[PDB]
Amino acid sequence: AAPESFDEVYKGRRIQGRPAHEHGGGYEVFVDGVQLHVMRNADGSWISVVSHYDPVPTPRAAARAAVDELQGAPLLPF
> Could you tell me which residues are annotated as the binding site?
22-23, 37, 39, 52-53
Q: DSSP string of 3-38?
A: PPPEEEEETTEEEEEEE------SEEEEETTEEE-E
Instruction: Decide whether 24 or 72 has the Cβ nearer to Cu ion.
Output: 24
Contact 2, 39 (CB under 8 A): no
Q: Applying CB under 5 A, does 63 fall inside the site for Cu ion?
A: no
Q: Applying CB under 5 A, does 62 fall inside the site for Cu ion?
A: no
Instruction: Decide whether 9 or 76 has the Cβ nearer to Cu ion.
Output: 76
Distance (Å, whole) CA 15 – CA 12: 10
# residues near Cu ion by CB under 5 A: 1
Query: Given candidates 39, 56, 66, 67, which one binds Cu ion under the rule CB under 5 A?
Result: 39
Provide the annotated binding site for Cu(2+).
22-23, 37, 39, 52-53
Q: 29 phi and psi, to 5 degrees?
A: -125, 145
